[PDB]
Amino acid sequence: NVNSLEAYRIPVHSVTETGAQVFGFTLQPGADTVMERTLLGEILNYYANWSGSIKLTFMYCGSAMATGKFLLAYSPPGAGVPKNRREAMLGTHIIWDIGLQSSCVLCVPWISQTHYRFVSKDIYTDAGFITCWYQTSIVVPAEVQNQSVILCFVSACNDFSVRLLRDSPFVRQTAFYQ
Amino acid sequence: NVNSLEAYRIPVHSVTETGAQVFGFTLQPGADTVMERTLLGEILNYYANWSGSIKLTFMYCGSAMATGKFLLAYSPPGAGVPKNRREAMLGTHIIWDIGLQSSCVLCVPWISQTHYRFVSKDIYTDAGFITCWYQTSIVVPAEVQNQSVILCFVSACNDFSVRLLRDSPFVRQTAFYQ
Amino acid sequence: GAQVSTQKTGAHEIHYTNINYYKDAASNSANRQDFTQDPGKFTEPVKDIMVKSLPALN
Amino acid sequence: GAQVSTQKTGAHEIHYTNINYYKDAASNSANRQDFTQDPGKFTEPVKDIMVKSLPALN
Amino acid sequence: SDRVRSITLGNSTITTQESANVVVGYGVWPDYLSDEEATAEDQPTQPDVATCRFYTLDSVSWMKESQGWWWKFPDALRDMGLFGQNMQYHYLGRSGYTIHVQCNASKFHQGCLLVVCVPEAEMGAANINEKINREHLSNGEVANTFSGTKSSNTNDVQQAVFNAGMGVAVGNLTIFPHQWINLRTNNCATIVMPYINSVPMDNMFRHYNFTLMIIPFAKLDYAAGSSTYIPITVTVAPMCAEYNGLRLAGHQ
Amino acid sequence: SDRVRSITLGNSTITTQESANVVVGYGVWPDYLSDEEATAEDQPTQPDVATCRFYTLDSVSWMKESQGWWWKFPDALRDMGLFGQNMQYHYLGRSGYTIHVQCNASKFHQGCLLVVCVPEAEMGAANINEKINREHLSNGEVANTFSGTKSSNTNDVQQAVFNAGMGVAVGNLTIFPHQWINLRTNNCATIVMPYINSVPMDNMFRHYNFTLMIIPFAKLDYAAGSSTYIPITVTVAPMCAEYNGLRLAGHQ
Amino acid sequence: VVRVADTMPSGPSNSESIPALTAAETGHTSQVVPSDTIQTRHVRNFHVRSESSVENFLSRSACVYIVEYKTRDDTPDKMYDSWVINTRQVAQLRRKLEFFTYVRFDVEVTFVITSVQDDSTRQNTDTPALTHQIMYVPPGGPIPQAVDDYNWQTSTNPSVFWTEGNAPPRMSIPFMSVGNAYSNFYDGWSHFSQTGVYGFNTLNNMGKLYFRHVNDKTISPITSKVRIYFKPKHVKAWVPRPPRLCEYTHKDNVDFEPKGVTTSRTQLTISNS
Amino acid sequence: VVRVADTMPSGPSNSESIPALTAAETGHTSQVVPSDTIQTRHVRNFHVRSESSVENFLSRSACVYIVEYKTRDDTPDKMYDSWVINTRQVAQLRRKLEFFTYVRFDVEVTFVITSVQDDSTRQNTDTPALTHQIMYVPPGGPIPQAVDDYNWQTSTNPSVFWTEGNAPPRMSIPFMSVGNAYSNFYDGWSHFSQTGVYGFNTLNNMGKLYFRHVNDKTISPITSKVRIYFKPKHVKAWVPRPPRLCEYTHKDNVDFEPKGVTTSRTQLTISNS
């Protein structure tokens, strides 16, 4: 789906009971396969040691008549990845409702041993595991489509920092450009 | 006519109806074939990036009894070269009469995108197209010759400038001068 | 014609010498102590600025 | 025996150091900051100067 | 002295060394519409640099036997630059003018012209009950020409120099702003004509505001060795121009 | 509340009842050229009533499967009234803009657009070493259209929604003035874009200043009984316009 | 001395003030401090955004073009070597400069020259120190046509003489754009009929360099390789843009092939696997 | 700090004041500002006539004469090499100095020396560093006659020793004219009977230079080439003149062949062709 615009759509729909995992991804701005090519991921791929808080913002692009609540968690490491919703709400979470306000903010705070992290993939510094969950399902009335699209945004808070320059691993050339 | 003094004479004479093009030349002080060897052209051939306004001055060297009016236009580029007098008077022009005052001044103002131009022949910076036109013909009484000579002068205004030094393209030597 | 300013050192734990030698400004050293910023024209690019407490286009 | 003067920089956006070393004036550097001009003896080389409003030898 | 006159309007300057004077209409200098006479309500466009400038029309020759010329002047500048464009795209236009007519001759020539700027010069037809075509009252910058005899063409303007088209006595045609280009002293003639009309802002295609008439009284007499072709060049410039009622292009 | 917004520019007024906000560029409101940045010397023409007004371009439809649109915007208003004429007759032009994009849908519809105003959007060609024709980067008010696949046409712009033509990552394309027309709340989107350029006054035919890109992220999904044709209408208006260097018509 | 913002303390709250709910449909980027989601303590944070400034990010020496030319050959064009001055032939320095649309920087050039002795029959020579001449030429200047042509005289042009065994040469170059900023992007043509070339190339106009050996015809050819390191400084940049995803193709355009937007996951939901 | 003149605003005018009409028949150059032809706006112009001053225009290093001399040969005149001091043998520096009639400048000389090993049977030598001696000689001084003649001793004369592998030598020369200005033009004879030579050559009288290798008879000849770069400074110039159109012929006169005044157009009136 990366050879298309389909990669930005997070699908979400009415479930049978409740409490399933829509999406979920590691927090590595520079070493992930999710936020690798985003603007924050590009700038941090020009750096090596970063710190500070990261905002996510979730626009809901469904219909004007459907509602639903979504648990937006953050699980710091030491434990694994929470496999059900009961294990997911024991971290920094937020319970977001869909109304007039179509976009939420999960402002991930800074919980860390060291001051600074690493951009590259390593074992000593791991960050957290975003996992989104149905708080309820999507109740939609008749003559409306069932499935919709959630988007995700990313940015940085007031105390974000980068420390060491380097070359980014995205430049892959062979010869000169005559 | 360059192997003679004939090259400085601009001939002008009585026409049948009206409105013909006596002379006309591009405005490239350093890359033209007209103002190439004039003093302004020599100094700007020692430079590369110039700016400022240019004066032309037209002495009339005809008889003491003939009159005539001449449209001295300036057409900034974007359009071509105005082919008749009706297309010529839609630029910066002047209507000059011949009387006691034998010399005119067409003071070409500064209308440009950039601050500075280029001396060399290029496409991105073109200047303007001087084109002289009969406003009327030359009415001359009997026992006087029909044809006369207009001269042209050139100078610079108060805000003329040059920026980069280089070698001029006029020095063409082969060996030393023993 | 000397200029004295503080070096770059960390918090909780100087006064170097700078003399401008050459006769131009393209020879002056790189001004690597400009820490100024203002994210007011990349965030909040708006008329009718938000409050963060009001419901923000209610 | 120091001399401090301004560098050459453009408008809308210094103070270098010059010490005269050798015992002559042919060793002094090139005085490349003389911007003075007066086109009063190459233009207007005349007696009975023009006004630009009068008809100028009427 | 006051023979050397200069006029600067925008980016076009006329310098003459044997002028006569500047006849300022009926004393009133051109002016924008003050809001004691305001009729329409939307904001007008006053270009003032790309409009108030000298536009040169076509040049005509004056032989020994030529009889006259007339130009309609809200119409002869139909296609002269942004005055022509801003004539086309609008609906109401108000502007003054500044006529300048170049015509030069040596001291061994003689003759005299007459440059009269007649408002509302409604002309009679050649036949009595015939409809004049639009291409005979005006031809744009192409000048029309009087005929000295009794003209009797079809769909044509009554060409007679002793009637001036309107049937008035052509000797009495000097009540308007007039100048005499007598060829022994003068190089040109200047008329600053303000906008005289019964409505404050009028259209510029349906209405012919005025007519510039050049009628020779003293014929171009000269020796058997002088230069025959003596042209006449006319160059005008609007003043205080403004335009009301922007709409889609065309006129119909 | 602040959902009802009105904009009056000259003689054309847009009233919307479900707007979002007005994104004023990078904070800087449009302004005339102050003479600390003055380069040319002749007096410019500032029409301010016949130019600073809303001009409506062509309307395009948005089906379930449409991929995008782009308009070059000193060029799509080539022939829209006296802005088009004063583009043609001059040589240097400076103007701000004010984008407004109408697109309405009911409450039983869903989808989301993205209105980004990218300066200097230099696009890559479909083939690697081919010269793009002028009639594929722009078509005036006729909108171009992205293709979601790998486009491989001759003399054509590289149409790919996941590259935005320039080869940038299209998710990262929100650094510019952008708004989201999510169809559940908003009726339109307003971008007041000032004139960003490296030269103070530039030509308006040789240079394409910027590109308005509408790229749908959430597709127009709806039931089996609703109205299929949901158009998209774009109407912009220049601001603080001025024009330098009047010359003869044309461009070559 | 400018610090980053600290953390203010917060507590248990029940308000109608909603930092979590915002309208991203207006283009306004939300401004939520972590003191408004959970109960954060007092943090006296001493981070300084020092090495992320636009001066600090671009003021590093980067190669642009390698130039190879020998001291004796059979053809006169394999001796000296020229180069047209541009920064868009190596993707690292180009990609770092293509965050922005317009920039204003002075260039500080450093040449690094290495000499490789070629293979021949008579390589056992007693070779003295080589000498190099680098003559800048403004746009429209004379064309050098040989290693012995009399256009290498530098009556006005900038030049530099180096002898192998010293520190590398260094000179500065002021701001030479005729506009107000070096346009890394220009969307337009060259002819006013919207024809000609499309660039990005109409506004390069930088001039060109030239290289030659000052020494005469040696009895053994020596392959010389000189590396040019641009180093900008005093940098002001305006109106940024996202970086380039697809790989580059040429120097005189922006053309490319479509690349996938990232690398796939083959899953969509994380777990302990 | 001296700016160029700004632009004053103007308006619609109808006056008897005529800036357009002037009398060019008096030699007075007219002084029309563009604020008197069309309606020009207010322009705050910040151009500075900086790099057009007479100091900035001529203070560039320019070559004058190449000197070639070997370290061992068969004839004593092909070893060392002399040169009579004059600036009128290369048309670039000469043409830049011939704007004026009289100038007053101090000269700052820089020599650039290159050594080319000749071809022989025994080129594989272990050659130490070469050494060069440049003995200035005032007019009337002793004549060196060999590389081992005892006139090279410099009991008073200015000299300089250079070793290959360093920065090039540089020395300054003060104003040495016996009059008040270096006459680039002298219309007159030498004998008071209006005979003799005609110059331009009667007032050169600058002295001459000499070059030799300080090293002894080497076992391999090395062709040495030294380039002299004059660099004037502290320049005052008087009573200018137009530059030279025709090409040069010699150094001791002003003689030439007639050249056409420009290149022809083959038309006289421009159009869209």
Short mmCIF file of N, CA, C and O in Angstrom, two decimals, chain B residues 66-130:
data_model
loop_
_atom_site.label_atom_id
_atom_site.label_comp_id
_atom_site.label_asym_id
_atom_site.label_seq_id
_atom_site.Cartn_x
_atom_site.Cartn_y
_atom_site.Cartn_z
N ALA B 66 14.98 73.96 -42.04
CA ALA B 66 14.11 72.79 -42.10
C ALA B 66 13.67 72.39 -40.70
O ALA B 66 14.43 72.52 -39.73
N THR B 67 12.44 71.91 -40.59
CA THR B 67 11.87 71.48 -39.33
C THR B 67 11.39 70.04 -39.44
O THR B 67 11.36 69.46 -40.53
N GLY B 68 11.00 69.48 -38.31
CA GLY B 68 10.52 68.12 -38.26
C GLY B 68 10.50 67.58 -36.85
O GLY B 68 11.32 67.98 -36.02
N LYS B 69 9.58 66.66 -36.56
CA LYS B 69 9.39 66.13 -35.22
C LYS B 69 9.67 64.64 -35.23
O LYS B 69 9.35 63.95 -36.20
N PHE B 70 10.26 64.13 -34.15
CA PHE B 70 10.70 62.74 -34.14
C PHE B 70 10.35 62.06 -32.83
O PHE B 70 10.71 62.54 -31.75
N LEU B 71 9.66 60.92 -32.93
CA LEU B 71 9.23 60.14 -31.77
C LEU B 71 10.38 59.24 -31.35
O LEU B 71 10.79 58.35 -32.11
N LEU B 72 10.88 59.43 -30.13
CA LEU B 72 12.03 58.70 -29.61
C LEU B 72 11.54 57.78 -28.49
O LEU B 72 11.46 58.20 -27.33
N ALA B 73 11.25 56.53 -28.82
CA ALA B 73 10.57 55.62 -27.91
C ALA B 73 11.54 54.74 -27.15
O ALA B 73 12.74 54.71 -27.42
N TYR B 74 11.00 54.02 -26.17
CA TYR B 74 11.70 52.98 -25.43
C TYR B 74 10.70 51.90 -25.06
O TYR B 74 9.79 52.15 -24.26
N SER B 75 10.86 50.72 -25.63
CA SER B 75 9.89 49.64 -25.42
C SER B 75 10.52 48.57 -24.54
O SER B 75 11.44 47.88 -25.00
N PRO B 76 10.07 48.42 -23.30
CA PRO B 76 10.61 47.36 -22.46
C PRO B 76 10.18 46.00 -22.97
O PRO B 76 9.12 45.87 -23.61
N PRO B 77 10.97 44.94 -22.74
CA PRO B 77 10.71 43.66 -23.39
C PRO B 77 9.52 42.90 -22.82
O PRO B 77 8.77 43.41 -21.99
N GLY B 78 9.35 41.67 -23.28
CA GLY B 78 8.16 40.90 -22.99
C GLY B 78 7.34 40.81 -24.25
O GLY B 78 6.82 39.74 -24.60
N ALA B 79 7.22 41.93 -24.94
CA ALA B 79 6.74 41.96 -26.31
C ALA B 79 7.93 42.10 -27.24
O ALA B 79 9.07 42.26 -26.80
N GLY B 80 7.67 42.04 -28.54
CA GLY B 80 8.75 42.08 -29.50
C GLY B 80 9.27 43.47 -29.78
O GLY B 80 9.47 44.27 -28.86
N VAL B 81 9.50 43.77 -31.05
CA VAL B 81 9.95 45.09 -31.49
C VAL B 81 8.79 45.74 -32.24
O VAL B 81 8.24 45.12 -33.16
N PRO B 82 8.38 46.95 -31.87
CA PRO B 82 7.17 47.55 -32.45
C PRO B 82 7.38 47.91 -33.92
O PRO B 82 8.28 48.68 -34.26
N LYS B 83 6.55 47.34 -34.78
CA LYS B 83 6.79 47.39 -36.21
C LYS B 83 6.27 48.65 -36.89
O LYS B 83 6.79 49.03 -37.94
N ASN B 84 5.28 49.33 -36.31
CA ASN B 84 4.83 50.61 -36.85
C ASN B 84 4.76 51.64 -35.73
O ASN B 84 5.05 51.34 -34.57
N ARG B 85 4.39 52.87 -36.09
CA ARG B 85 4.44 53.98 -35.14
C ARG B 85 3.35 53.85 -34.08
O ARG B 85 3.52 54.32 -32.95
N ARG B 86 2.23 53.19 -34.42
CA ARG B 86 1.14 53.01 -33.47
C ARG B 86 1.54 52.06 -32.35
O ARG B 86 1.12 52.24 -31.20
N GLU B 87 2.35 51.05 -32.65
CA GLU B 87 2.86 50.19 -31.61
C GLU B 87 4.03 50.81 -30.87
O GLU B 87 4.40 50.32 -29.79
N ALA B 88 4.63 51.86 -31.41
CA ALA B 88 5.83 52.43 -30.81
C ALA B 88 5.52 53.42 -29.70
O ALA B 88 6.32 53.57 -28.78
N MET B 89 4.38 54.09 -29.76
CA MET B 89 4.04 55.12 -28.79
C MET B 89 3.36 54.58 -27.55
O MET B 89 2.89 55.37 -26.72
N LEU B 90 3.29 53.26 -27.38
CA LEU B 90 2.82 52.65 -26.15
C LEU B 90 3.95 52.30 -25.19
O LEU B 90 3.76 51.47 -24.30
N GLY B 91 5.12 52.91 -25.37
CA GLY B 91 6.19 52.82 -24.41
C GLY B 91 6.60 54.19 -23.89
O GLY B 91 5.95 55.20 -24.16
N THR B 92 7.68 54.19 -23.12
CA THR B 92 8.30 55.44 -22.71
C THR B 92 8.85 56.15 -23.93
O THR B 92 9.80 55.68 -24.56
N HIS B 93 8.25 57.28 -24.30
CA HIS B 93 8.65 57.97 -25.51
C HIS B 93 8.88 59.44 -25.19
O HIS B 93 8.75 59.88 -24.04
N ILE B 94 9.25 60.20 -26.22
CA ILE B 94 9.33 61.65 -26.16
C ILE B 94 9.11 62.17 -27.57
O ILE B 94 9.42 61.49 -28.55
N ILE B 95 8.48 63.33 -27.68
CA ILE B 95 8.19 63.94 -28.97
C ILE B 95 9.07 65.17 -29.07
O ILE B 95 8.82 66.18 -28.40
N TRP B 96 10.09 65.10 -29.91
CA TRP B 96 11.12 66.12 -29.98
C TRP B 96 10.98 66.97 -31.22
O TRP B 96 10.86 66.45 -32.33
N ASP B 97 11.05 68.29 -31.04
CA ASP B 97 10.93 69.27 -32.10
C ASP B 97 12.30 69.88 -32.38
O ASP B 97 13.17 69.91 -31.51
N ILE B 98 12.46 70.38 -33.60
CA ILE B 98 13.71 70.98 -34.05
C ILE B 98 13.49 72.47 -34.17
O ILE B 98 12.65 72.93 -34.96
N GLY B 99 14.23 73.24 -33.39
CA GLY B 99 14.15 74.69 -33.44
C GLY B 99 15.50 75.34 -33.20
O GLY B 99 16.48 74.99 -33.86
N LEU B 100 15.54 76.29 -32.27
CA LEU B 100 16.82 76.82 -31.82
C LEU B 100 17.59 75.74 -31.06
O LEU B 100 18.79 75.54 -31.28
N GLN B 101 16.90 75.03 -30.17
CA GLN B 101 17.51 73.93 -29.43
C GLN B 101 17.71 72.74 -30.36
O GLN B 101 16.75 72.06 -30.73
N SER B 102 18.96 72.51 -30.74
CA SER B 102 19.26 71.50 -31.74
C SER B 102 19.39 70.10 -31.17
O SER B 102 19.37 69.13 -31.94
N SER B 103 19.51 69.95 -29.86
CA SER B 103 19.74 68.65 -29.25
C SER B 103 18.66 68.32 -28.24
O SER B 103 18.22 69.18 -27.47
N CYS B 104 18.23 67.06 -28.25
CA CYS B 104 17.23 66.54 -27.32
C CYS B 104 17.89 65.69 -26.25
O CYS B 104 19.08 65.38 -26.31
N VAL B 105 17.09 65.29 -25.27
CA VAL B 105 17.50 64.29 -24.28
C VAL B 105 16.35 63.30 -24.10
O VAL B 105 15.27 63.69 -23.64
N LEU B 106 16.57 62.05 -24.46
CA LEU B 106 15.71 60.95 -24.04
C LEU B 106 16.38 60.28 -22.85
O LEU B 106 17.36 59.54 -23.02
N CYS B 107 15.87 60.53 -21.66
CA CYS B 107 16.44 59.98 -20.44
C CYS B 107 15.70 58.70 -20.11
O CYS B 107 14.61 58.73 -19.53
N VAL B 108 16.30 57.57 -20.48
CA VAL B 108 15.71 56.25 -20.29
C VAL B 108 15.69 55.92 -18.80
O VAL B 108 16.76 55.79 -18.19
N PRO B 109 14.53 55.76 -18.19
CA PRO B 109 14.47 55.46 -16.76
C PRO B 109 14.80 54.00 -16.50
O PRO B 109 15.13 53.23 -17.40
N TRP B 110 14.69 53.62 -15.24
CA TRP B 110 15.10 52.30 -14.79
C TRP B 110 13.86 51.48 -14.44
O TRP B 110 13.24 51.69 -13.39
N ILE B 111 13.50 50.56 -15.33
CA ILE B 111 12.38 49.65 -15.13
C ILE B 111 12.94 48.25 -15.22
O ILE B 111 13.28 47.78 -16.31
N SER B 112 13.05 47.57 -14.08
CA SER B 112 13.73 46.28 -14.06
C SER B 112 13.23 45.44 -12.91
O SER B 112 12.83 45.95 -11.86
N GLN B 113 13.27 44.13 -13.12
CA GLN B 113 12.98 43.19 -12.04
C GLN B 113 14.11 43.19 -11.02
O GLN B 113 13.91 43.55 -9.85
N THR B 114 15.30 42.80 -11.45
CA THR B 114 16.44 42.76 -10.55
C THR B 114 17.03 44.15 -10.38
O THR B 114 16.69 45.10 -11.10
N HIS B 115 17.92 44.27 -9.41
CA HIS B 115 18.68 45.50 -9.26
C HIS B 115 19.69 45.66 -10.38
O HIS B 115 19.78 46.73 -10.98
N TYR B 116 20.44 44.60 -10.70
CA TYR B 116 21.56 44.67 -11.62
C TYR B 116 21.30 43.84 -12.86
O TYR B 116 20.52 42.88 -12.83
N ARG B 117 21.94 44.22 -13.96
CA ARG B 117 21.84 43.52 -15.23
C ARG B 117 23.09 42.70 -15.48
O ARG B 117 23.95 42.54 -14.61
N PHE B 118 23.21 42.17 -16.69
CA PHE B 118 24.43 41.54 -17.15
C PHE B 118 24.95 42.25 -18.38
O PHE B 118 24.18 42.73 -19.22
N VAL B 119 26.27 42.32 -18.49
CA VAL B 119 26.89 42.90 -19.68
C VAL B 119 26.79 41.93 -20.85
O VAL B 119 26.47 42.33 -21.97
N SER B 120 27.05 40.65 -20.60
CA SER B 120 27.14 39.65 -21.65
C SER B 120 25.76 39.36 -22.25
O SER B 120 24.72 39.65 -21.66
N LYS B 121 25.78 38.79 -23.44
CA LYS B 121 24.56 38.43 -24.14
C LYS B 121 23.93 37.22 -23.45
O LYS B 121 24.55 36.15 -23.38
N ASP B 122 22.72 37.39 -22.93
CA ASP B 122 22.00 36.30 -22.30
C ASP B 122 20.50 36.53 -22.47
O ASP B 122 20.07 37.54 -23.04
N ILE B 123 19.72 35.58 -21.97
CA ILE B 123 18.28 35.60 -22.22
C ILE B 123 17.49 36.12 -21.01
O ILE B 123 16.49 36.82 -21.19
N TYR B 124 17.97 35.85 -19.79
CA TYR B 124 17.22 36.17 -18.58
C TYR B 124 17.07 37.67 -18.35
O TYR B 124 16.06 38.11 -17.79
N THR B 125 18.03 38.48 -18.78
CA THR B 125 17.97 39.93 -18.61
C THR B 125 18.05 40.60 -19.98
O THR B 125 19.13 40.73 -20.55
N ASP B 126 16.90 41.04 -20.49
CA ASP B 126 16.84 41.89 -21.66
C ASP B 126 16.25 43.24 -21.26
O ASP B 126 15.46 43.33 -20.32
N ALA B 127 16.65 44.29 -21.97
CA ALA B 127 16.52 45.66 -21.48
C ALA B 127 15.42 46.48 -22.14
O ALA B 127 14.59 47.05 -21.44
N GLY B 128 15.44 46.60 -23.45
CA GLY B 128 14.59 47.54 -24.14
C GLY B 128 15.05 47.73 -25.57
O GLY B 128 16.14 47.35 -25.96
N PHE B 129 14.17 48.35 -26.36
CA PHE B 129 14.39 48.43 -27.80
C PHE B 129 14.11 49.85 -28.26
O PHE B 129 12.95 50.21 -28.51
N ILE B 130 15.17 50.66 -28.36
CA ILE B 130 15.08 52.00 -28.90
C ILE B 130 14.62 51.94 -30.35
O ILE B 130 15.14 51.15 -31.15
#
